[PDB]
């Protein structure tokens, strides 16, 4: 957790492997619930694989950490408030660290592909400070990332499901945000999932639908720590399957309508489905921002409507 100083952020591990430490540049937050961000350009231009993550966080002050891969970080320089954004392009989430929900490891043989022609060129670290009650001292919290240039037999990726058009009228008891897309790639295997909502979300659920049958991928209270939780049973999604997600929102407590957006007063319905694929079939990211089968949600399991 200590700042690195003279030895810097790159530690050789083996002939082909190295650790990259992505830390805050000795920051001292002034308010509670501060969101700090920073970027590291990858040290290698060629293709590499992220096979492990080690959290390096002060247990007193850090609420959560997020690590992203992208090509255009929102800001240049040393560090910034993530109120100005994380990445200008698509931020590909790699890792979440929650205080009250310790992370689960990548399965062995699984890595994210980064760098090269098409991979992420930058890491962006987001650190959410909770208490900030310490003393006035400098903080260097972050993540140690294990990189290798040995190709991995299985490639990790992210299937992101997000609402874009949700409107939650003020005081409205239940507002559903439904998301659905047909899967049209090679088989992916879901091993982890993360849900994200702001203060109005009560339950988020995602399913694979295969010939009318709903198989649960993940279902979580978004007010609980937003870590990646492992899937109960590894769920394969194959060509012709439908991915379906529902967030349940309340409008109660709000004087005005709440829509999708980036601030605390806005909402989000995000479901991050972390998968692996065979390397020769793999693609690193997919997104569903649509609702292609809206009448299919008539047979959605009851669990998706009651809170956990």
> 3-class DSSP state for residue 296?
helix
> CB under 5 to 8 A by kind: which of Cu ion, Ni ion, ligand NO2, none does 212 bind?
ligand NO2
- Nearest CB to Cu ion, comparing residues 114 and 127: 127
d(CA 281, CA 216) in angstroms, rounded, equals: 24
Q: What string marks each residue from 221 to 260 as x (binds Ni ion by CB under 5 A) or -?
A: ---------------x------------------------
For the CB of residue 210, give the shortest distance to ligand NO2 in the complex, in Å: 5
Q: Which of 209, 245, 282, 304 binds ligand NO2 (CB under 6 A)?
A: 209
- Nearest CB to ligand NO2, comparing residues 149 and 290: 290
268 is in an annotated binding site: yes
For the CB of residue 241, give the shortest distance to ligand NO2 in the complex, in Å: 6
278 binding Ni ion? (CB under 5 A): no
For the CB of residue 234, give the shortest distance to Ni ion in the complex, in Å: 6
290 binding ligand NO2? (CB under 6 A): no
For the CB of residue 182, give the shortest distance to ligand NO2 in the complex, in Å: 8
- Residue 245 near residue 194, CB atoms below 8 Å: no
Among 1, 103, 4, 3, residue whose Cα is nearest residue 59: 1
Strand ranges in 71-200 using DSSP code E only, listed in sequence order:
80-81, 92-98, 110-114, 122-129, 142-148, 154-162, 167-168, 175-182, 188-196
Q: What string marks each residue from 227 to 266 as x (binds ligand NO2 by CB under 6 A) or -?
A: ---------x---xxx-------------------x----
d(CA 268, CA 166) in angstroms, rounded, equals: 8
- Residue 244 near residue 294, CB atoms below 8 Å: no
- Residue 300 near residue 215, CB atoms below 8 Å: no
Point out which residues pair with 55 in neighbouring strands. 143
Which residues belong to the active site? 63-64, 126, 128, 196, 198, 268
């Amino acid at each position: 957790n200590e700042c690195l100083g003279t030895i810097g952020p790159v530690t050789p591990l083996d002939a082909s492997d190295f650790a990259l430490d992505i830390r805050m540049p000795g920051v001292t937050p002034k308010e509670s619930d501060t969101y700090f961000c920073m970027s590291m350009r990858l040290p290698v231009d060629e293709e590499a694989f992220v096979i492990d993550f080690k959290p390096r966080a002060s247990m007193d002050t850090v609420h959560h950490m997020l690590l992203f891969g992208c090509n255009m970080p929102s800001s240049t320089g040393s560090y910034w408030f993530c109120d100005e954004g994380t990445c200008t392009d698509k931020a590909n989430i790699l890792y979440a660290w929650a205080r009250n929900a310790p992370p689960t490891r990548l399965p062995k043989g699984v890595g994210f592909r980064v760098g090269g022609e098409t991979g992420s060129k930058y890491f962006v670290l987001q650190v959410h400070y909770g208490d900030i009650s310490a003393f006035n001292h400098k903080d260097c919290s972050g993540v140690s990332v294990h990189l290798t240039r040995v190709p991995q037999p299985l490639i990790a990726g992210m299937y992101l499901m997000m609402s874009v058009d949700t409107v939650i009228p003020p005081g409205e008891k239940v507002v559903n945000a439904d998301i659905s897309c047909q899967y049209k790639m090679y088989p992916m295997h879901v091993f982890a999932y993360r849900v994200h909502t702001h203060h109005l979300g009560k339950v988020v659920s995602g399913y694979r639908v295969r010939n009318g049958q709903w198989t649960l991928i993940g279902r979580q209270n978004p007010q609980l720590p937003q870590a990646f939780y492992p899937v109960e049973h590894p769920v394969d999604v194959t060509f012709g399957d439908i991915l379906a997600a529902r967030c349940v929102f309340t409008g109660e407590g709000r004087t005005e309508a709440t829509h999708i957006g980036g601030t605390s007063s806005d909402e989000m319905c995000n479901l991050y489905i972390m998968y692996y694929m065979e390397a020769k079939y793999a693609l690193s990211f997919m997104t569903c921002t649509k609702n292609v089968a809206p009448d299919m949600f008539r047979t959605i399991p009851a669990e998706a409507n009651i809170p956990i």
